[PDB]
Ligand SMILES: [Cl-]
């Protein structure tokens with residue numbers, strides 16, 4: 313096998329693999345297959361099983377999602393990324409068609425080959441960074457005014473945010489067969505189905521200062537646990553209350569009908585949040601229905617923006 317050495321070689325020369333030694337890519341070489349495609353060619357058809365990912369060396373591709381009612385909704389991406397890795401890890405059927413807009417050169421691997429990549433030095437963080445950059449393009453932070461009169465910016469979490477934050481990861485993602493930590497961790501960073509996190513930032517592109525999440529009690533449950541965090545300087549400023557409003561809009565839109573929570577005696581704040589939905593305490597715990605979108609005290613236009621942001625980010629992460 314001499315191809316393998318030559319393979320490793322081409323791989324090493326990709327932007328994607330900058331700073332890896334060609335030899336250290338030799339096993340991965342054994343697991344990747346080159347692909348060439350012509351303009352117009354389907355690289356991935358909607359309804360296909362998720363069997364492989366593709367690493368594209370060069371060639372612009374076009375992603376579209378066919379809707380049963382009215383024409384397919386379409387988008388470009390430049391090369392240098394991986395496509396199909398979410399569906400692959402989720403074993404879901406593809407929901408979006410992908411077509412070569414330009415001649416396409418690249419590399420196809422299975423899930424084991426993707427796990428190989430995840431373990432190569434530097435590579436898990438690099439993949440998270442590529443995901444973060446791709447997703448940022450689908451986020452417009454929404455300026456929001458908290459009851460203090462301070463302005464912050466509301467946006468879905470991004471891959472890489474340090475607040476995104478193993479056993480908790482499996483106990484969710486239990487539908488991934490024979491998984492690795494690395495596979496679970498990467499899916500965690502790009503998950504907007506089972507997990508939905510809202511972040512509030514100091515300025516439109518500034519640090520996260522608070523966050524709120526729901527975690528469905530199983531892949532697709534209408535019951536979801538909630539948790540809120542608020543940074544140090546920022547307590548008692550109306551923030552968790554606001555985020556809860558964002559969290560309600562997102563739940564409704566994706567069909568989460570119920571919330572549960574539990575934590576410390578100490579943070580009344582959390583009790584006060586659940587309180588406002590008429591919680592039921594039994595360190596303490598509760599369940600509540602998610603109220604109708606009706607009752608979050610935000611302007612209709614803000615409701616539509618939070619829903620569209622929810623829409624866009626889910627759609628980014630649907631392959
Ligand atoms: Cl891209």
Ligand SMILES: [Cl-]
Pocket residue numbers: 401402403487488489
């Ligand atoms: Cl699986």
Ligand SMILES: [Cl-]
Pocket residue numbers: 493
């Ligand atoms: Cl580790």
